[PDB]
Amino acid sequence: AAVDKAKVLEDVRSIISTQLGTELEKVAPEAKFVDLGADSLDTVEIMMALEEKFEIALEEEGAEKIATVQDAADMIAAQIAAKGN
C-alpha cells in the first residue's frame, strides 16, 4: 500500500553501483543503463540482483520497458506495494 520510495530508490542505486563498478554519486536517478557501462546481457543480471536484494518477483512486460533507474525503482515499489493483497 503505502511504500517509501526514498529507501527503495537509495537501495536500487546502491545495487546498480555495486553491480557495475561505478561510484554511487555518479549513477543519477535518471541515468539510463547503456551509458553507465552495461550492454543488453547485463541489464538482466542487474534485474536478477534486484530481485535477489528485495526478494520479490518482477513482472516481465514491465521489465521489457525499463530504461531509467527511476522506472526500475518505481516498478519495484509497485511490486512491494501490492504484496498482502
Binding site: 543488453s40 546481457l41 541489464t43 538482466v44 543480471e45 518477483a57 516481465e60 521489465a63 521489457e64 525499463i66
Partner: protein, 127 residues
Amino acid sequence: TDIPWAEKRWTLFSTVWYLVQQLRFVGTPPALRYVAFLGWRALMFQVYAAHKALVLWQCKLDAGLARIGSGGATATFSKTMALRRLHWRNSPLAEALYALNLYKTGRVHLLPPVAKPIPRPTFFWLF
C-alpha cells in the same frame, strides 16, 4: 483457516505418508533435523547459482540463433523470456515452439502464452 478440502482427503497413500512425516516430526531429535536443514539450505543455494548461470547461457544461445533466423540485424533477446525462464513459467513445448519460431522468423517479441498451474493429482481411495 483456508485449507482447500483437497488437502484433507483420506487415502491409502496419505496414511503411509503419515508414518513418514510423524517419524520426521516426533521420532527425530531437533538437533539432527537442524543440521540436515543447514546442509539442505547450502545445497539449494548452489543449485540456484547453477540455474542462473544456465539461464544466462540460454539467453546468449537464443540471441545467437535469432540472428540465423531473421537473417539480418537483430542480435536481441527478450528480458521477458529470461525472467520467465528464471521463474519456471514455461512448459517444454513452449520453449521448443519458441526456438523454432526464432530460428525461422526471428520475431523475438512473440512469446508462448504462459504455463498454467498444475493441479493436485487424485485417483480414488488409492491416492
